[PDB]
């Protein structure tokens, strides 16, 4: 295509890191806390998003061009399969991300009772339940498209999950501020690090699929409007941002803790 590579390089880029984020969870022994299991589930769902979207794009480029011929009835079914994989992957990515946020919030606010609340077996159970529910949703959402209820659910999920991802990190940052105001009042001795961290985590999750879900909710709010139509006309780069998240999330979750970096450099040695 004229700019087909924008759906490919990003996907290929997801190869170079989302595999490693998985590999770094099953190669270091002490990275078997619930949080890093949720990180691995996130990486799996991000790889699925990238691959499924890239393969749909390659199929579309082939069919609409003159490189392949195929019956339309089978095209509709391969379309539904690609779409269902994408939707499964997207909902799993969002659920894994919220699971990381909830694990951190519980680890801090229930700091002493944490091990009597969450073990690695319970984390495996949560991952299994998340992926089961996400596969079910990614099947139902595309076996029934074109229904305002399905888009309504796919928007309510993002809204009610952005709200929670924001609020957990706001409470975490306000606690860290109550701590830095106590460290500062020490004889012989800033929230900028916390503010930039909360900003990056809450903004990567927004600059990547606030636009796609805003497009979805505009398609059901003001489709007979030019203001909203000029917005919806950029669904191409909305998909591009959807893919860019699967590049950003490893950098802002698994490329920052020093243990992950250590096992990553151990991997790169080999």
């Amino acid at each position: 295509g004229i700019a087909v590579e924008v759906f490919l390089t990003l996907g290929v880029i997801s190869l170079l890191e989302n595999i490693l984020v998985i590999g770094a969870i099953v190669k270091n022994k002490n990275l078997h806390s619930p949080m890093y299991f949720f990180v691995c589930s996130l990486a799996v769902a991000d790889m699925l998003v990238s691959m499924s979207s890239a393969w749909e794009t390659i199929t579309i480029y082939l069919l609409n061009n003159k490189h392949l011929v195929i019956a339309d009835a089978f095209v509709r079914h391969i379309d539904n399969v690609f779409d269902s994989m994408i939707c499964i992957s997207v909902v799993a990515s969002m659920c894994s991300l919220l699971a990381i946020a909830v694990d951190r919030y519980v680890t801090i606010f229930y700091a002493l009772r944490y091990h009597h609340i969450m073990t690695a077996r319970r984390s495996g159970a949560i991952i299994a339940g998340i992926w089961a529910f996400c596969t079910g949703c990614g099947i139902v959402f595309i076996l029934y498209s074109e229904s305002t209820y399905v888009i309504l659910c796919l928007i309510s999920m993002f809204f009610a999950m952005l709200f929670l991802l924001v609020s957990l990190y706001i409470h975490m940052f306000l606690l860290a501020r109550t701590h830095v105001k106590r460290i500062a009042a020490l004889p012989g001795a800033t929230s900028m690090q916390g503010a930039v961290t909360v900003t990056m985590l809450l903004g990567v999750f927004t600059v990547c699929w606030a636009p796609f879900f805003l497009h979805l909710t505009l398609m059901l709010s003001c489709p007979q409007n030019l203001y909203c139509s000029r917005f919806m006309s950029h669904f191409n780069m909305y998909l591009i941002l959807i893919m860019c998240n699967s590049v950003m999330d490893p950098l802002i979750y698994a490329f920052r803790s020093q243990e992950m970096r250590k096992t990553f450099k151990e991997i790169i040695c080999c």
């Binding site: 979207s53 749909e56 579309i60 069919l63 609409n64 391969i78 994408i86 595309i142 909305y238």
Partner: peptide, 7 residues
């Protein structure tokens, strides 16, 4: 066979 869904 259109890109993504609900376009």
């Amino acid at each position: 066979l259109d890109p993504x869904r609900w376009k």
